[PDB]
């Protein structure tokens, strides 16, 4: 592009005696990254690219130092430094070609344009291995869920295609990937999920808790004359099932994050990080919070009255200082149902 | 008219349009209690006036 030297070499002509070639080609694609002259499109369409005047120098890596860019010939690379840069050059020119350049003379100055057509298309991809195609360390790639070193390095958790139903794409690989490689585990990863997302907040887990209802549809405590059973099913009218409904508390001390956990702020961060990434249909999770008194108003219209289920933060017109309280509840991270129906067919008679 | 009952479900926030509906319902419950003993619509329990401003012609009450 015309903007590629008009940004770089017209303004930044102060470190070109000691610049790296590794650094230089990176800033070209960072000069116009919006719809860039993609280096992978070399395979048919090097015409109309206007790339940088590296080639014809015959230089190794990090030894491009000379800085001359024309503007009239509509393609900036026309460079041949004589007596230097013979990188891999062994024998002189053939017999019939010297008879057309006549005779390895001043006409050779207009011959290396065609002659270095081969070295132009190779030092593109020579660079591309060191920086994009086998190195990038998921750091020189630096993508936004496009760069292939992410997708090669994230399918070992089993998320291709499963970005569906998530309001964000897969971004929390940076810390959860060591934790998300052990199977069937754990409880202590939920501490990392909170300390990542908002510091100043701590987490404690109680493994079992007194869950309640599920109301059984036959009451089953009819005392039966024809047939009944004893061995396990003994109860009253509502059952209790402990087995899988853990309790989680949070504890903040910066009031800017207190208004982040009430629904709308950071509650959408946990509610999608659990349900499809770390737990899924393993368990159900209960949330709770403990702060000092509140910051909560009252009966204003359509939608933001409720501090979960409870209300407070409005009545103390008496005393100066603190009392600690539990805050509220948040909903479970559950997903269930029955669908409706009765059936019509069967499996197989074997 | 149309007089509605509220439902105090958990996870149902707060509207001041609700409390007006419930409070204008036991008033309707008061009539169905009372209309088992009534012919014709109601009247005056007590009414007292102050007649001092009659020569300066004005009329104002004391207890009503």
Please give the backbone phi and psi of residue A115, each rounded to the nearest 5 degrees, phi first. Answer: -70, -35
Q: What is the DSSP letter of A262?
A: S
Residue length, chain B?
Answer: 64
For residues B29 and B17, the answer to whether their CB atoms sit within 8 Å is no
Asked if the C-beta of A298 comes within 8 angstroms of chain B's C-beta atoms, the answer is yes
Please give the backbone phi and psi of residue A292, each rounded to the nearest 5 degrees, phi first. Answer: -90, 170
Tokens of residue A48, six digits: 């109309």
Asked if the C-beta of A221 comes within 8 angstroms of chain B's C-beta atoms, the answer is no
Chain A partners within 8 Å of B11 (Cβ): 306, 309, 331
User: CA nearest A233: which of A220, A215, A218, A217?
Assistant: A220
Nearest residue in chain A measured CA to CA from B12: A306
**What DSSP letter does each residue of A135-201 carry, written as one string?**
--TTTTS--SS-SHHHHHTTTTTT-SSTTTT-SS-S-THHHHHHHTTSTT--STHHHHHHHHHSTT-
Sheet holding A324-330, edge to edge: A202-206, A247-251, A286-292, A324-330
For residues A211 and A240, the answer to whether their CB atoms sit within 8 Å is yes
CA distance A307 to chain B (A): 9
Tokens of residue B55, six digits: 């020569």
Q: 3-class DSSP state for residue A107?
A: helix
- The H or E element containing residue A249 is strand A247-251
CA distances from A132 to A37, A123, A140, A306 (A): 15, 14, 7, 51
User: CA nearest A55: which of A5, A126, A120?
Assistant: A120
Would you tell me how many other CB atoms lie within 10 Å of the CB of residue A37?
19
Please give the backbone phi and psi of residue A254, each rounded to the nearest 5 degrees, phi first. Answer: -110, 120
CA dihedral (A237, A241, A245, A251) in degrees, to 10, reads 70
Asked if the C-beta of A303 comes within 8 angstroms of chain B's C-beta atoms, the answer is yes
Q: Do B11 and A301 touch (CB under 8 A)?
A: no
Chain B partners within 8 Å of A302 (Cβ): 15
User: CA nearest A247: which of A278, A288, A212?
Assistant: A288
CA distances from A300 to A263, A296, A297, B16 (A): 17, 11, 8, 8
- Which stretches within chain A are classed as H helix? 3-7, 21-31, 95-101, 112-115, 117-128, 148-152, 173-179, 189-197, 255-261, 267-273
For residues A226 and A167, the answer to whether their CB atoms sit within 8 Å is no
Please give the backbone phi and psi of residue A214, each rounded to the nearest 5 degrees, phi first. Answer: -35, 115
Would you tell me how many other CB atoms lie within 10 Å of the CB of residue A297?
12
In units of Å, what resolution does this entry have?
A: 4.3
Chain A partners within 8 Å of B18 (Cβ): none
Please give the backbone phi and psi of residue A215, each rounded to the nearest 5 degrees, phi first. Answer: -80, 120
Chain A partners within 8 Å of B8 (Cβ): none
* Range A222-243 burial, b when 16+ CB lie within 10 A, else e: eeeeeeeeeeeeeeeeeeeeee
For residues A328 and A295, the answer to whether their CB atoms sit within 8 Å is no
Chain B partners within 8 Å of A301 (Cβ): 15-16
Q: 3-class DSSP state for residue A17?
A: helix
Angstrom distance (rounded) from CA A14 to CA A24: 13
How was this structure determined? It was done by: cryo-EM
Helices first, then strands: H and E counts in chain A: 10, 4
Residue length, chain A?
Answer: 350
Q: Is beta strand A247-251 parallel, antiparallel or unpaired with respect to A202-206?
A: antiparallel
CA distance B32 to chain A (A): 32
> What residues have CB less than 8 Å from A107, skipping those under 6 apart?
A101
CA distance B39 to chain A (A): 42
Tokens of residue B32, six digits: 């169905």
Interhelix angle A117-128/A21-31, rounded to 10 degrees, is 90
User: CA nearest A75: which of A55, A99, A96?
Assistant: A55
Nearest residue in chain B measured CA to CA from A331: B11
- Which residue in the block uniquely carries the two structure tokens 């501090």? A307
Q: Do A309 and B13 touch (CB under 8 A)?
A: no
Is the peptide bond preceding residue A103 cis, with omega within 30 degrees of 0?
Answer: yes
Chain B partners within 8 Å of A329 (Cβ): none
Angstrom distance (rounded) from CA B16 to CA B9: 16
Is the peptide bond preceding residue A188 cis, with omega within 30 degrees of 0?
Answer: no
**What DSSP letter does each residue of B1-64 carry, written as one string?**
---------TT----HHHHHHHHHHHHHHHHHHHTTS-SS----S--EEE-TTTTTT--EEEE-
User: CA nearest A243: which of A207, A205, A286?
Assistant: A207
> What residues have CB less than 8 Å from A168, skipping those under 6 apart?
A272
For residues A246 and A282, the answer to whether their CB atoms sit within 8 Å is no
Q: 3-class DSSP state for residue A203?
A: strand
Nearest residue in chain A measured CA to CA from B8: A309
Q: What is the DSSP letter of A261?
A: H
Strand segments, DSSP code E, in A297-338 are 324-330
Angstrom distance (rounded) from CA A63 to CA A60: 6
For residues A215 and A166, the answer to whether their CB atoms sit within 8 Å is no
Chain A and chain B share a number of CB contacts under 8 A equal to 18
Q: Do A299 and B11 touch (CB under 8 A)?
A: no
User: CA nearest A286: which of A175, A166, A206?
Assistant: A206
- Which residue in the block uniquely carries the two structure tokens 């369409």? A45
Taking an 8 Å Cβ-Cβ cutoff, which residues of chain B contact chain A?
Answer: 10-11, 13-16
Asked if the C-beta of A182 comes within 8 angstroms of chain B's C-beta atoms, the answer is no
User: CA nearest A127: which of A24, A254, A205?
Assistant: A24
Chain B partners within 8 Å of A306 (Cβ): 11, 13-14
Question: Which of B12, B13, B16 to mutate to test binding with chain A, by most A CBs within 10 Å of its CB?
Answer: B13
Largest CA distance in chain B: 64
For residues A113 and A102, the answer to whether their CB atoms sit within 8 Å is no
């Amino acid at each position: 592009s015309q903007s590629a030297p008009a940004r770089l070499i017209t303004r930044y002509r102060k470190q070109l005696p000691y610049i790296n070639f590794y650094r230089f080609c990176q800033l070209l694609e960072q000069s116009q990254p919006d719809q860039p002259p993609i280096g992978s499109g070399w395979q048919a369409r090097q015409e109309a690219v206007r790339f940088c005047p590296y080639p014809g120098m015959g230089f190794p890596a990090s030894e491009i130092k000379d800085a001359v860019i024309p503007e009239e010939s509509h393609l900036p690379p026309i460079v041949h430094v004589t007596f230097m840069g013979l990188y891999g050059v062994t024998s002189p020119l053939p017999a019939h070609y010297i008879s057309d350049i006549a005779q390895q003379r001043e006409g050779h100055e207009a011959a290396a344009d065609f002659l270095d057509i081969f070295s132009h298309r190779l030092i593109t991809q020579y660079y591309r291995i060191w920086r994009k195609y086998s190195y990038p360390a998921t750091f020189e790639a630096g993508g936004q869920d496009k760069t292939s070193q992410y997708l090669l390095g994230l399918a070992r958790l089993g998320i291709p295609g499963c970005a569906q139903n998530i309001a964000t794409p897969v971004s929390r690989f940076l810390a959860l990937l060591p934790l998300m490689l052990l199977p069937g585990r754990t409880a202590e990863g939920l501490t990392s999920l909170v300390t990542l997302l908002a510091p100043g907040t701590q987490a404690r887990v109680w493994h079992h808790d007194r869950r309640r209802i599920p109301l059984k549809t036959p009451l089953t405590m009819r005392v039966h004359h024809p047939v009944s059973l004893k061995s396990r099913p003994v109860m009253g009218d509502h059952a209790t099932d402990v087995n899988g409904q853990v309790l989680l508390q949070l504890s903040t001390q910066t009031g800017s994050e207190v208004q982040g956990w009430l629904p709308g702020g950071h509650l959408y961060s946990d509610l999608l990080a659990l349900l499809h990434v770390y737990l899924g249909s393993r368990l159900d999770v209960r949330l709770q919070l403990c702060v000092e008194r509140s910051l909560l108003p009252d009966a204003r219209l359509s939608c933001r009255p409720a501090a979960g289920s409870p209300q407070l933060g409005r009545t103390a017109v008496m005393r100066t200082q603190a009392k600690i309280a539990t805050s509220a509840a948040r909903v479970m991270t559950i997903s269930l149902g029955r669908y409706q129906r009765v059936q019509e067919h069967y499996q197989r008679k074997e | 008219m149309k007089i509605y009952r509220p439902l105090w479900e958990d996870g149902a926030f707060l509207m001041p349009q609700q409390f007006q509906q419930q409070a204008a319902w036991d008033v309707h419950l008061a009539d169905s209690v009372a209309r088992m003993g009534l012919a014709h619509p109601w009247g005056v329990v007590a009414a007292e006036f102050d007649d001092s401003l009659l020569p300066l012609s004005r009329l104002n009450a004391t207890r009503l």
